[PDB]
From Swiss-Prot:
Designated name of the protein: Bromodomain-containing protein 1
Tissue expression as described in the entry: Highly expressed in testis.
Organism: Homo sapiens
Function: Scaffold subunit of various histone acetyltransferase (HAT) complexes, such as the MOZ/MORF and HBO1 complexes, that acts as a regulator of hematopoiesis. Plays a key role in HBO1 complex by directing KAT7/HBO1 specificity towards histone H3 'Lys-14' acetylation (H3K14ac), thereby promoting erythroid differentiation.
Residue(s) of cross-link: Glycyl lysine isopeptide (Lys-Gly) (interchain with G-Cter in SUMO2): 41
Full-sequence range covered: 555 to 674 of 1058
Amino acid sequence: SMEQVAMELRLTELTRLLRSVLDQLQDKDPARIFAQPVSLKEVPDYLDHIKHPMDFATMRKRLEAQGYKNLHEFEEDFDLIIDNCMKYNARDTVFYRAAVRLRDQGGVVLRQARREVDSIG
Ligand code: NA
């Protein structure tokens, strides 16, 4: 049906916008601390600590399958990246501090993303 097609075009345009958001967030991580999953070969104890690992590559896979239905879902995964790092790593570490700086800088990007999603529909 045409109504199904129109819903599919909307998901496609959300996907486009979330790709630009994902790129902008990821530029805020020039060290590439959050680029890839934590390897269970190098942090064997990770999944004892962190129940829902997340990283930018994982998000990009989901996005490319149009797997985010709304901005809230995308934000959930971005918050996992930050919040997982802030739990596993101590305050005095480069990892924790990188997560704080990503959260702060990413707030800007997500604030306008929300306005664009609401405005375009
Ligand atoms: Na901790």
